[PDB]
Design a protein around this ligand. Structure first.
Ligand code: NAP
Ligand code: NAP
Lengths: 314, 314
């Protein structure tokens, strides 16, 4: 059996990967909670790699937050992500771990990128300021992977998710991520018999959403492809792979779908006196498709299962 | 007296800073060689900051090299610079060091930036591939400084030099940096009575060069300006300051000047069958000038003194 370390295994993405691999009689999972292993401590991370005989790493540990957190604690987001990724990648190489998958973010891309965003949009323009420190740390993780690949002949791959949703998200009305926020807001409005739920903006911007279990499936698929196939569809210094659906949906359609999913019978209202973001933002997933993976979970089916998860975990 | 840690004090830039501050009866220098303090070791760096009562840090330690090294050892250049800067900045903040100057590189700028390059060219386009890993590590250092400034109210400033030359450079014919390489090549051609020295390219590209002692002077000037004056001339998320002359010179003029400086009486020859780089590359130093510093060392005077340094240190 392959000994697989899922860093960050209790996180939203890491736990989705663990759920699928836990079914794999060919894999032996090696898991450490934060309390057992602080990924910021270089010595502790090296001691772990020197004693645990790992074959593969899923690097799903990160300091991640929403708009308020990213603007309020920028040093936490840059410093902690730099250190976690540098520690893990360095220790993996020192202990002859040849396979690693770095799970990043779509905040890597420029604020005004061409849509849909192909992987080659990386570094083509200015970042969103809210996420800039975090994004630079994420980009440094990709470039660590590519530099170890080039200098040492490692196989350190990387995937960048689009907006994610699903079990183990933060379902609080204040979340800046629209899916969990709206699921929660509509749930509470249906409990209260509120006449309406008002969403800021016009509802016209188009966005892209992927269920976390699809993210995990794509991630395992990308990790386990033959190296020559992964090489054919990447370039050494442009190596990351976008993971998503490649399909747009208006915030209007999303909100109306959520309202149906939850059984809300009041009105969804958009307040267009508040500003919209850019008109369209989504990943180009041609590379992923070419690599033979296509998502399985449609928005309405994924929202419904995600809401059932929330219901069972209130 | 202010207790000033010059990280990297034996380096080309760090030693220039040390030469000038060593004359300052208001400053107490705290210096550690690599053998005494490995800047990659987070624990050792934190122990140093916890015991040495530092007031100011000049962060001049880095893993720096030329074209062959950057392409050959990309992981060394990204990983070591990430760790040195993350360790120092984190330990400085944990121990209430409020003032720091991060000394970076002009490789931060896009390959096809607008010339002359203002600070706002950062992140506007794709990096030069040779230096990409190094450049990302450098950019992460700026963004660490800005994030600690914003989250904690620190005063972690940053300067980006143009091409540097001067004492303590590597004067080997194989250096990819044109000034030290040409000084050495012309020195050897004058020793050998070689009829000519052939330089690849046409000699038409325009480049910018700054003597290291000017770099050090500008760096100390920027570190010691009042914070409100530094704030007036920067922005929190666009905080770095270019250090240079702002003036172009053709590689032709440079080579002919070097030949005169060394006393070569053979011919300088350009072989235009070999390709040139971009036609023009230099920093816009308006911000530095506005902050009241202007370079003092002209090219011919700086080449002559630098050659006299080489002569005395063969
Ligand atoms: N506040 C937000 O809006 C928010 C936050 C997280 C996730 N999300 C949603 O979930 C999506 C995916 O999140 P994600 O899975 O990347 O993040 P995540 O759910 O926060 O998972 C990151 C995992 O890394 C662990 N970790 C962080 N630092 C560690 C350290 N020093 N040592 C060991 N473990 C460490 C975290 O543990 P600890 O929790 O113990 O720190 C956590 O289990 C995000 O894109 C967003 O859609 C939203
Ligand atoms: N090969 C090249 O072409 C080359 C190399 C260096 C400088 N330069 C010229 O000099 C210009 C400025 O160079 P620079 O001053 O930034 O570089 P530098 O002269 O190499 O100085 C960097 C200093 O940091 C020290 N350092 C690096 N890692 C360290 C660690 N882990 N612990 C403690 N000390 C550490 C180095 O010590 P150690 O030497 O002991 O590693 C060195 O003293 C470059 O732009 C170029 O013009 C050229």
């Amino acid at each position: 059996k392959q000994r697989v370390f899922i860093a960050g295994h209790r996180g939203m993405v890491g736990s989705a990967i663990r759920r699928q691999l836990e079914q794999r009689g060919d894999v032996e999972l090696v898991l450490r909670t934060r309390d057992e292993l602080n990924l910021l401590d270089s010595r502790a991370v090296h001691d772990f790699f020197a004693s645990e005989r790992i074959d593969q790493v899923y690097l799903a540990a990160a300091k991640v937050g929403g708009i308020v957190a990213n603007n309020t604690y920028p040093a936490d987001f840059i410093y902690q992500n730099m250190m976690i990724e540098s520690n893990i990648i360095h220790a993996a190489h020192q202990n002859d771990v040849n396979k690693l998958l770095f799970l990043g973010s779509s905040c890597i891309y420029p604020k005004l990128a061409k849509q849909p965003m192909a992987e080659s949009e990386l570094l083509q323009g200015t970042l969103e300021p809210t996420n800039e420190p975090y994004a630079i740390a994420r980009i440094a993780g990709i470039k660590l992977c590519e530099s170890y690949n080039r200098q040492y002949g490692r196989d350190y791959r990387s995937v960048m998710p689009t907006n994610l949703y699903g079990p183990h998200d933060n379902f609080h009305p204040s979340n800046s991520h629209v899916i969990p926020a709206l699921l929660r807001r509509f749930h509470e409005a249906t409990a209260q018999s509120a006449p309406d739920v008002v969403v800021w903006g016009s509802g016209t911007p188009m966005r892209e959403f992927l269920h976390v279990d699809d993210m995990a499936a794509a991630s395992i698929h990308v990790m386990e492809l033959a190296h020559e196939v992964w090489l054919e569809n990447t370039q050494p210094m442009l190596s990351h792979i976008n993971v998503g659906t490649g399909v747009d949906c208006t915030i209007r359609e999303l909100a109306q779908t959520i309202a149906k999913v939850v059984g809300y019978k009041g009105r969804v209202v958009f307040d267009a006196s508040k500003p919209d973001g850019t008109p369209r933002k989504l990943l180009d997933v041609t590379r992923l498709h070419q690599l033979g993976w296509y998502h399985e979970i449609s928005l309405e089916a994924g929202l419904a299962s995600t809401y059932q998860w929330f219901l069972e975990n209130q």
